[PDB]
Design a protein around this ligand. Sequence first.
Ligand SMILES: Nc1nc2c(ncn2[C@@H]2O[C@H](COP(=O)(O)OP(=O)(O)O)[C@@H](O)[C@H]2O)c(=O)[nH]1
Ligand SMILES: Nc1nc2c(ncn2[C@@H]2O[C@H](COP(=O)(O)OP(=O)(O)O)[C@@H](O)[C@H]2O)c(=O)[nH]1
Ligand SMILES: Nc1nc2c(ncn2[C@@H]2O[C@H](COP(=O)(O)OP(=O)(O)O)[C@@H](O)[C@H]2O)c(=O)[nH]1
Ligand SMILES: [Mg+2]
Ligand SMILES: [Mg+2]
Ligand SMILES: [Mg+2]
Lengths: 397, 397, 397
Amino acid sequence: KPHVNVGTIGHVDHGKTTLTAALTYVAAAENPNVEVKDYGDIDKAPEERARGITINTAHVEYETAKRHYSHVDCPGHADYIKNMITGAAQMDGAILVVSAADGPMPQTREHILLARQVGVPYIVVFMNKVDMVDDPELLDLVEMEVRDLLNQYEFPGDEVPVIRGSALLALEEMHKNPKTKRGENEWVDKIWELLDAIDEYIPTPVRDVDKPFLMPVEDVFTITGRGTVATGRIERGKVKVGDEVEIVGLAPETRKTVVTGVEMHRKTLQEGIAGDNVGLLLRGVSREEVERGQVLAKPGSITPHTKFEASVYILKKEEGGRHTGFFTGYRPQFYFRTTDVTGVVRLPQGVEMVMPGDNVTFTVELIKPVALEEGLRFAIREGGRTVGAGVVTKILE
Amino acid sequence: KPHVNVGTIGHVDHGKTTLTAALTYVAAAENPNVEVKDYGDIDKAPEERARGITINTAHVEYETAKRHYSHVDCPGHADYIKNMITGAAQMDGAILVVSAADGPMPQTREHILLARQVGVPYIVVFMNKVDMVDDPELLDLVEMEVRDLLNQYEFPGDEVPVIRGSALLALEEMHKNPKTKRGENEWVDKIWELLDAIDEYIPTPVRDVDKPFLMPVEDVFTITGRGTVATGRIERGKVKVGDEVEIVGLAPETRKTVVTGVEMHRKTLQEGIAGDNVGLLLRGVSREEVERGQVLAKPGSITPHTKFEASVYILKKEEGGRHTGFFTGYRPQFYFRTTDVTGVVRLPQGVEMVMPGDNVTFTVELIKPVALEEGLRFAIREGGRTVGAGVVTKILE
Amino acid sequence: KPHVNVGTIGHVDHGKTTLTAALTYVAAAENPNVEVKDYGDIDKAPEERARGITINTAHVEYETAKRHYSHVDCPGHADYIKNMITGAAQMDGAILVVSAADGPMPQTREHILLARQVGVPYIVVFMNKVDMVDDPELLDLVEMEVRDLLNQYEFPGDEVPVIRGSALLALEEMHKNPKTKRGENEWVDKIWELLDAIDEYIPTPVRDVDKPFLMPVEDVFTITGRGTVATGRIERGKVKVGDEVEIVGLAPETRKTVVTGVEMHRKTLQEGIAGDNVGLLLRGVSREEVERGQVLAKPGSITPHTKFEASVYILKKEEGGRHTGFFTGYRPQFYFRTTDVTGVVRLPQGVEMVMPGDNVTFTVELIKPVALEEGLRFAIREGGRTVGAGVVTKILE
Ligand SMILES: Nc1nc2c(ncn2[C@@H]2O[C@H](COP(=O)(O)OP(=O)(O)O)[C@@H](O)[C@H]2O)c(=O)[nH]1
Ligand SMILES: Nc1nc2c(ncn2[C@@H]2O[C@H](COP(=O)(O)OP(=O)(O)O)[C@@H](O)[C@H]2O)c(=O)[nH]1
Ligand SMILES: Nc1nc2c(ncn2[C@@H]2O[C@H](COP(=O)(O)OP(=O)(O)O)[C@@H](O)[C@H]2O)c(=O)[nH]1
Ligand SMILES: [Mg+2]
Ligand SMILES: [Mg+2]
Ligand SMILES: [Mg+2]
């Protein structure tokens, strides 16, 4: 029963939390396993330490016929910014909640943008609080505000599902009648539309193991009679001997070789699979030709680069980051996967100085190339300390 | 109509094959379904690839009032060694054939031993070729030679059935008169005693689903808000949620949990049954506390160990095995169910070096414990390659 | 643009063929694709071999806005009896043509009855030759003869559409003016009424893939470590693993299992779909519990039986069937789907001996049960030869 990661985003007070609890109670009915949670519990998210940052985050699990959804919900707009970016929990899709009373709001528009920068593959809307509004001209109005926003950030606003309802009401019915099921109640039934929407519109994702092969080099060693060895946990896909791969990054050019040998826990091994911390025998590679920080991957699967654009969040001083701001020309270290790689920043027009606590978008240009791809997450460091966290959003070269 | 697995064993030329063709013909008469086979067909067994080994093996099915018997027969003494050991086809009982003219012979004695190591629950004798000997002093002699051998290997030689007849003669009658039935002919009737003897003496076996629950861990996973998941095909019995089971092997100690969730083909599932490839939800178990190679089983059903005795067969080089022999201290990989577990061998007094193609018996001692039981079959590997096949014969600790 | 199957039935000379050619040319006008055919071409049907029988049958395709109709028309009353029964081509609806000059006639009445036995879902009438009769008292008379007949065989004669016209005349206008469209001409416009009638009155059919899952067992096998396998072409709907199905027929009782494995062209497969020749892995099913001749189907979708009524056609001797007639007590083999199942026949009152060439209606009673449903087509064989063809018309138990 495939597993998917979702979460509620949207402006404060629009009701992402109440809608969250409803989802549990409602789906539980047809899925007894499913552990029902209420408002207060979810409303009080725990802290979570991620990349050096703390994010109040709440989680919940619910099941449909089609799947198992683990679902996030945070208490503050800040928690959203940080979560999404450090990618504490990675949305495979997200449920966007908007007050029918207010239409989309600033955070609303912000979560859309992030969701797009950080790569959310699909957004589905749940217009809540609809019980405060009869006038369908109004409900239409809001729906439309919302779609144009989505369209502004490239979501297919024209297509997503905008389901209108009352999380508050549905939740009480689940309260009154835990055993209520489909067709029985109206408010509950909008939740079923949401849930259906989800199962339908949010793509079932690629299992890591099926994604193109990539393993990031951690250590390099020579086995006297055997040769050069790149070690590290495989991020995705798999390798079996005889497999040819590319050593990407840092070097001036990409090299190709053949795993002539996997190995783990000392013993040998026939295939290296995602999740696996192996050591591979690279064939025809000097101890120079390969180094920590490069990546090995299924050939042609990833490219090296130096100029890219990123969405970033800069730690506060209180969180252990910088204590004064910076300008274009700031040149910290960019820690990609396993190592630092210096880079110079260039703030966009309109930005003149970035401050501790901000979150912005700029370009960077690195000293050496690195196997980069959009969505590639990273850290910004000053002497080993993390001063910020970002996500790669665009390659420029 | 319960199904039982049998077959002929005994020395070369004693007539296990001719006896084989007679059982079909004879029992066909009262069971028309029954497909009659002759000597030549059975005589030419096909090869069968089992555990990396090739075994000429012949099969035949016959029915009595009481049952359905699928019956094996191999052409050579090697074939028996291999078959019995890799357990290509598992004997529920065996029919031991001995030439009345010669008495038991070397392979005769060997098969008895194997059958005992390999676990054959019952042996029943068919003394054949009796047409060559009038002297009842002789016939008794052999019978008793036979009983003492069985007694020597722990079979209840004193009690088994030693039926005296001529497979050759019964077979021709069935030939002359397919329709011949009980009471009609003498030679045929000896076959009826055999068949009766079989139905009577060979215990009717436990249906897997009825054996105590056991499932060997193949993969372990976590379902975020759900938890830990042990996957694999169920070997025996069944599981339903809330069932409590032990996690056995590898770890320093046995753990108990509760399946909190079965599941198959994505969808859910109320009960896990023998033959089924599920994924169970283990309650309160770290992703560490459970691993591939262990087994989950009905509590108190199977115990972990490291020292055991085993009867083994070593591949010839021509079959892809080792190409030189070995001594005590040999330390290959013993592949139990799903994983390799290193072990050191100790040859018994009298054996000093084992060679490719040999089949012997020795003790082993594993690096980590494993859920072992007598009868547990396994492989001996050297770099993923299978260099021998064995069966666990006794537990030492 | 859904596809539907129709055709013209009715007495000889009433003009089923001339009206057939008109539909092409008329509908063509608004559907350029549509291939126009004339009288002579449709008049000269080719043979078709169906169930061993030869049927002169003519085909034609035309399009309305609403659909795609493939449309049959045969030359002789025999052709109709044969066709309808062996169901060479299955009518989703039929267009019944009657001469306004003569009213319904014997074949007219015959066709209604068959269409009812054979299961035609809707009849729509086209009263033709109307140009030979001014007196509306007459035209009303015929129409009413017609409706009473349909009412006699359970069609809703009171409701169906009785469209009055001249196929011959519409056809010449289309001839004169291929481009003639609606409103332009009167005779053509009557054809438009027929076409609308059809699109409206004849219910839109179920695509096979959407009908309930059913697959008829052709062979049964065992995959040693996997278990039992039923193979054969899926007749309707689809199967995906984890799907539960019922094994129906032959056995004394219906069993339920789960496909635990589909498979085709050696490779595996995620879903088994109508048309596909798979092999299914039945879970928990003995090699006895399943056999050729039964069907696997969506649970509760079809039931086993032994007594049924049927409309049948008996081959002439010249066509290779019996060379003498038979009485009640006749007990041939009823070849349902894949196998023969013996049955005894009982001629109805009034019928005393059936002869080669006859087509009649009687009851049968099978030795073992079979997954039967009205509409189920079958063959009557004598030693492998087909001596007749029929259709199941009613279940009696
Ligand atoms: N009228 C109305 N009020 C709602 C509905 N959903 C939630 N509310 C309330 O709106 C407030 C915001 O709820 P909340 O879920 O906590 O939103 P969050 O800030 O996005 O976490 C709470 O007081 C809820 O009781 C609803 O459908 N209709
Ligand atoms: N006289 C006699 N010879 C027999 C009888 N059974 C088998 N034979 C012969 O024994 C020889 C070996 O028979 P077979 O069944 O092949 O022995 P197996 O190699 O143990 O299979 C053949 O030539 C048979 O004809 C019997 O009951 N009496
Ligand atoms: N008067 C008149 N004759 C017609 C009409 N339609 C058909 N005919 C003639 O009917 C005769 C037999 O018709 P046909 O279409 O072959 O019918 P089928 O016997 O059902 O195959 C032919 O000579 C046609 O030309 C019509 O509408 N009016
Ligand atoms: Mg909240
Ligand atoms: Mg033999
Ligand atoms: Mg015609």
